[PDB]
Amino acid sequence: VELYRALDAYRARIAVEYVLIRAVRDEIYAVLRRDGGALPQRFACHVSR
Amino acid sequence: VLTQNVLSALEILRLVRLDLRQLAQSVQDTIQHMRFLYLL
Protein backbone atom coordinates (compact mmCIF):
# COMPACT_ATOMS: atom_id res chain seq x y z
CA VAL A 1 0.00 0.00 0.00
CA GLU A 2 2.89 2.37 0.69
CA LEU A 3 4.38 1.77 -2.75
CA TYR A 4 0.89 2.28 -4.20
CA ARG A 5 0.51 5.65 -2.49
CA ALA A 6 4.05 6.64 -3.48
CA LEU A 7 3.25 5.80 -7.10
CA ASP A 8 0.10 7.93 -6.86
CA ALA A 9 2.12 10.85 -5.48
CA TYR A 10 4.59 10.41 -8.34
CA ARG A 11 1.69 10.42 -10.80
CA ALA A 12 0.46 13.70 -9.34
CA ARG A 13 4.02 15.04 -9.60
CA ILE A 14 4.53 14.52 -13.34
CA ALA A 15 0.94 15.47 -14.24
CA VAL A 16 1.44 19.13 -13.28
CA GLU A 17 2.32 20.49 -16.73
CA TYR A 18 -0.28 18.42 -18.58
CA VAL A 19 -3.14 19.57 -16.35
CA LEU A 20 -2.13 23.17 -17.11
CA ILE A 21 -2.09 22.36 -20.83
CA ARG A 22 -5.59 20.88 -20.54
CA ALA A 23 -6.69 23.94 -18.57
CA VAL A 24 -5.65 26.13 -21.51
CA ARG A 25 -7.31 23.78 -24.01
CA ASP A 26 -10.61 23.79 -22.12
CA GLU A 27 -10.31 27.56 -21.82
CA ILE A 28 -9.92 27.93 -25.59
CA TYR A 29 -12.96 25.74 -26.22
CA ALA A 30 -14.98 27.53 -23.52
CA VAL A 31 -14.18 30.97 -24.93
CA LEU A 32 -14.97 29.69 -28.43
CA ARG A 33 -18.37 28.46 -27.21
CA ARG A 34 -19.04 31.71 -25.34
CA ASP A 35 -18.21 34.01 -28.24
CA GLY A 36 -20.05 31.95 -30.85
CA GLY A 37 -17.01 31.54 -33.07
CA ALA A 38 -16.63 35.28 -33.66
CA LEU A 39 -12.93 36.08 -33.50
CA PRO A 40 -11.89 39.75 -33.37
CA GLN A 41 -8.58 40.86 -34.85
CA ARG A 42 -5.86 41.35 -32.27
CA PHE A 43 -2.75 41.06 -34.49
CA ALA A 44 -1.90 43.21 -37.50
CA CYS A 45 -2.30 41.55 -40.90
CA HIS A 46 -3.95 42.89 -44.04
CA VAL A 47 -6.85 40.56 -44.80
CA SER A 48 -8.92 39.87 -47.89
CA ARG A 49 -12.62 39.10 -47.99
CA VAL B 1 19.67 -52.17 5.44
CA LEU B 2 17.35 -49.83 3.59
CA THR B 3 14.28 -48.87 5.67
CA GLN B 4 16.42 -46.87 8.09
CA ASN B 5 17.86 -44.90 5.15
CA VAL B 6 14.45 -44.18 3.63
CA LEU B 7 13.11 -42.88 6.96
CA SER B 8 16.31 -40.90 7.58
CA ALA B 9 15.72 -39.28 4.19
CA LEU B 10 12.06 -38.69 5.12
CA GLU B 11 13.45 -36.73 8.08
CA ILE B 12 14.62 -34.15 5.49
CA LEU B 13 11.74 -34.66 3.06
CA ARG B 14 9.50 -33.16 5.74
CA LEU B 15 11.61 -30.00 5.50
CA VAL B 16 11.25 -30.29 1.71
CA ARG B 17 7.45 -30.23 2.07
CA LEU B 18 7.85 -27.18 4.31
CA ASP B 19 9.92 -25.47 1.61
CA LEU B 20 7.28 -26.36 -1.00
CA ARG B 21 4.64 -24.66 1.14
CA GLN B 22 6.94 -21.65 1.59
CA LEU B 23 7.54 -21.31 -2.16
CA ALA B 24 3.84 -21.62 -3.00
CA GLN B 25 3.04 -18.91 -0.46
CA SER B 26 5.77 -16.73 -1.99
CA VAL B 27 4.33 -17.23 -5.49
CA GLN B 28 0.82 -16.31 -4.35
CA ASP B 29 2.23 -13.31 -2.46
CA THR B 30 4.06 -12.08 -5.56
CA ILE B 31 0.96 -12.51 -7.72
CA GLN B 32 -1.13 -10.55 -5.22
CA HIS B 33 1.60 -7.90 -5.03
CA MET B 34 1.61 -7.44 -8.80
CA ARG B 35 -2.19 -7.62 -9.15
CA PHE B 36 -2.72 -4.98 -6.46
CA LEU B 37 0.00 -2.57 -7.56
CA TYR B 38 0.46 -2.66 -11.29
CA LEU B 39 -3.03 -3.24 -12.76
CA LEU B 40 -4.65 0.21 -12.83
From Swiss-Prot, chain A:
This is Capsid vertex component 1. Capsid vertex-specific component that plays a role during viral DNA encapsidation, assuring correct genome cleavage and presumably stabilizing capsids that contain full-length viral genomes. The chain holds residues 348 to 396 of 594 of the full protein. It is found in: Virion; Host nucleus. It comes from the Viruses. Interacts (via C-terminus) with capsid vertex component 2/CVC2. Belongs to the herpesviridae CVC1 protein family.
UniProtKB/Swiss-Prot annotation, chain B:
Transmembrane segments: none annotated. It is found in: Virion tegument; Host cytoplasm; Host nucleus. It comes from the Viruses. Large tegument protein that plays multiple roles in the viral cycle. During viral entry, remains associated with the capsid while most of the tegument is detached and participates in the capsid transport toward the host nucleus. Plays a role in the routing of the capsid at the nuclear pore complex and subsequent uncoating. Within the host nucleus, acts as a deneddylase and promotes the degradation of nuclear CRLs (cullin-RING ubiquitin ligases) and thereby stabilizes nuclear CRL substrates, while cytoplasmic CRLs remain unaffected. Belongs to the herpesviridae large tegument protein family. Interacts with host CUL1 and CUL4A; these interactions inhibit the E3 ligase activity of cullins. Interacts with inner tegument protein. Interacts with capsid vertex specific component CVC2. Interacts with the major capsid protein/MCP. This is Large tegument protein deneddylase. It comes from Human cytomegalovirus (strain AD169). The chain holds residues 2202 to 2241 of 2241 of the full protein.
